[PDB]
Design a protein around this ligand. Sequence first.
Ligand SMILES: CCCCCCCCCCCCCC(=O)SCCNC(=O)CCNC(=O)[C@H](O)C(C)(C)COP(=O)(O)OP(=O)(O)OC[C@H]1O[C@@H](n2cnc3c(N)ncnc32)[C@H](O)[C@@H]1OP(=O)(O)O
Lengths: 7, 392
Amino acid sequence: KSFSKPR
Amino acid sequence: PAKTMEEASKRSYQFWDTQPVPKLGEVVNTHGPVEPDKDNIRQEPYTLPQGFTWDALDLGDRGVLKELYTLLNENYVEDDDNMFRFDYSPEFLLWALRPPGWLPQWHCGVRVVSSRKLVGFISAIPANIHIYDTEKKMVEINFLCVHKKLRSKRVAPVLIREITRRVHLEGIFQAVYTAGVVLPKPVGTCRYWHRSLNPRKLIEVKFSHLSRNMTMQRTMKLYRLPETPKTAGLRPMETKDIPVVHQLLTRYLKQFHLTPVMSQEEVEHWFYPQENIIDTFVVENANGEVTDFLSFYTLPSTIMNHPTHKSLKAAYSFYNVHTQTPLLDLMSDALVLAKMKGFDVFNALDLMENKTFLEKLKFGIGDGNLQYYLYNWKCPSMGAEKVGLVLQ
Ligand SMILES: CCCCCCCCCCCCCC(=O)SCCNC(=O)CCNC(=O)[C@H](O)C(C)(C)COP(=O)(O)OP(=O)(O)OC[C@H]1O[C@@H](n2cnc3c(N)ncnc32)[C@H](O)[C@@H]1OP(=O)(O)O
């Protein structure tokens, strides 16, 4: 639902 | 849209202020509905802008399912930098949208009147939800999507009101849902973490990057995994395991404050393995008893604007139950299994007990929050480790 990338 | 909690208080919520949810600044010390159940419900669909019409999508029609697949593939959630977009498969959409109790009117489409083009969607599926000391029949709202060319035209509030109306018609007055943005008012805030499986592909597509004092050779060695899992008796879930998987899950989830309450049929639906959708492995010990299980679902993403790499194969942690195998070992085997199955990355949220293994198993924190919300239910917020609910 929320697209995340490594911070 | 506001992604941060303080930057959301600088925002005015013209739509959400009209809805039965707590205000973003509100602090909650009660437990119950925002407003009473309605004993008369609007019979007519809400009005859409001229030239658009409602259409319930029969996902058992392969052509209609494909139209939904295309709408989402082209217009659904992207990352912050517009480099990746979710690519839910048709058969995954069938899994997510036709659980036990699904209703056709809750697959709520919007079409152009002239062309019949599908340009909007929202869905509800039924779910029994345990929230603190209360068990409520609710719906889960998912797949809210408005075509890019229809954006910023107040179409999303209409989709929300219309699915609300259709859910009210069936006698349900609460919902649960998640989002990457901040809205009134999160019941809990979770964070995605990522575990590199093919670090080479991930860096080449700029999903991840090389750490400052690290090289590529070191990065590949850092993320190397065993060829085969180590837990004795780990095997794919079979039909005979459905009762014990239901039992293990029900008992395991009592410790959290926001959880699903699944029937045995729902357990069959959500966990019975389907290739390229959902994987579940149980631990069957030396006595023949199932004592643990792990599960993860398949959700690839489109890589935009890249000449060579077109898709990123991602595994998402689902529900992991341990009673005799340590959680850390269970999740290590999940990484090995995902690696074996060709996944590029393994994602997991920081909810339930996941913080006990994320750092140790070399997950890196992500930049996206996942906010959890309840509609028409007032309760205190909770920390990520008390959220025991995973949505697709
Ligand atoms: C009892 C039963 C109850 C059932 C209902 C329970 C509630 C269900 C709630 C839905 C659960 C969804 C769960 C998922 O599926 S989360 C996934 C959401 N989908 C996407 O992000 C896909 C890509 N984006 C789009 O398709 C569009 O940008 C969307 C459709 C997101 C907004 O389209 P558009 O860009 O054209 O916006 P607008 O001008 O029409 O309207 C703007 C108004 O809508 C508010 N907004 C923006 N995004 C969201 C959002 N993601 N949830 C709730 N509200 C949202 C916005 O702040 C503003 O409100 P306010 O700031 O004025 O107040």
